[PDB]
Amino acid sequence: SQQTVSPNIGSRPRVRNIPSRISIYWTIVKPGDILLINSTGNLIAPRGYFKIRSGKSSIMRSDAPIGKCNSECITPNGSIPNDKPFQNVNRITYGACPRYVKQNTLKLATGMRNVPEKQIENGWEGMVDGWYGFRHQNSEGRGQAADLKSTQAAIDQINGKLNRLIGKTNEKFHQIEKEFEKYVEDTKIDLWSYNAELLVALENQHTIDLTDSEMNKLFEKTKKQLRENAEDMGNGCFKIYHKCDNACIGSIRNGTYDHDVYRDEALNNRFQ
Amino acid sequence: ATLCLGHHAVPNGTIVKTITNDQIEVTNATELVQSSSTGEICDSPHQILDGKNCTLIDALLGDPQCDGFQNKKWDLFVERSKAYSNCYPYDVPDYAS
């Protein structure tokens, strides 16, 4: 390379009462090469050289205080935890950070559709030990019990997708952290905001379908179990045409029930 | 004599989005977007160099107020809005580079 700069004598607006200036220039000299300076005046010569490394390091414009703590992700608005897969704090980031999205909130469904008592989909605010269960009114009285099979099946699936969504697994992850123009940055944030909006929709569509299925499966399991011994009493209830003690309902809900035992007894009450 | 089949419910649930629904109430949900911050940069695990009253170019050229920055290293240099120069007036044609 070669850099020729001509000194320009002329007064410029006074800065710290100086009408003069110094224009700074730089030159990188490669291991083989030689630095050659020719000057007949006005040169601001070097005193030596600087070490010039690859990358990884950076600069940030921020007025946020530095504090004694450990956080992997830095933004000009202070450090942020990298739990969640996305963030809305700042498009400027230094560590292993969540991606920047326009959205300030993306709610990931981690449950089932809310259909409450107050206004088969019989939403019970009273069932808090499981996502799906049974309510009976027999000879002995009333009672409620949750089905832990359908519940654990729903929990396990939400656990699976949740972990995959928030990293915390062993991989090359689903939403890999960003490391790190205007137009390019806006193009990026629009495509990433689209991704986040679609992913959450897809994920939640699956979770609703998931939980709706588990409920339908448990109702049909009961239907195939009771068979002719009961009738689909409109809503989410069945009408068992015999008497069942707290042990008979237990046998239905715990799966150890058969139509042959209560066969003739059910055939009697039905034809009346 | 009457066996009912239901599910869990909450008085007020969280409204979410699916493929067929833009507003759908669910029992439980979680956040996927970090909106909040303490308002402070953490020292660990990165080397932070607080420029203070100095700009990186001022620390590079060697402005007296920036003598403390000599031969210093960093993972991230933190440049302050209130930083100023206090040596010979200068201009860097192609400063950002």
């Epitope: 808090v128 030990d129 996502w131 832990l148 519940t151 654990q152 949740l162 | 909450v10 029992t27 439980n28």
Partner: antibody
Framework: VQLVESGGGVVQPGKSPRLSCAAS?????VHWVRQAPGKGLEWVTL????????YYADSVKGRFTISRDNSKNTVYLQMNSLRPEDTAVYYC??????????????????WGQGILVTVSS | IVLTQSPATLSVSPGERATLSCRAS??????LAWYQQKPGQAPRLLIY???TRASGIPARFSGSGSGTDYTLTITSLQPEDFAVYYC???????????FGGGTKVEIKR
Amino acid sequence: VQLVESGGGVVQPGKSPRLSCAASGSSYAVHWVRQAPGKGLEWVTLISYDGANQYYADSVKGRFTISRDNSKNTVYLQMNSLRPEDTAVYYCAVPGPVFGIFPPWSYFDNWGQGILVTVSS
Amino acid sequence: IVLTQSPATLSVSPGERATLSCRASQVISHNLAWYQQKPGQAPRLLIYGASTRASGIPARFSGSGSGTDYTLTITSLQPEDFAVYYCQHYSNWPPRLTFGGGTKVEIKR
């Protein structure tokens, strides 16, 4: 939601000591996790929120009994058919919620102070 | 299902990072919880659902894993973190509850 335990001290095999775990005013399910001296944690039993279901480990199956008096807001670990392998610090625990629901089998977000029993004669 | 914790003891100096492993005999679908037990007192819940950190627990405790291989990380270990740690499995349909052997986070000297 502090938990308080009682019924410790030294006990001679043949006796049937009763371990009590009281609350602070509704009701969840209650588990019992024991720790032998110098050894690690071992899950022994649990009782449902209502009491309909009770689960015991193979170690204490047929020897230990779990009951609950909602009226007194307590759970009772009735331990009979003693073995000197029951010398442990007994901790009662409350299962934590998962995705809004509180099923009996889970992590423990609430623990009792710990009560030591000594099967020795 | 059986939980195997490694190492039985881990020698760490303050400032350093600790990596506590929990191996399950078969897939536990992230139903794991981590506890800190100081001498004399009851175990303290740190993480649940393998990755979810308990209310008020310092940010340095990081729970991860999948399949049968799970991990507990303490990014910048404080002198108050030297204790015994136990991983815990739990399940409602196949009813199960197991605790690992435990690992001692000992002061490196």
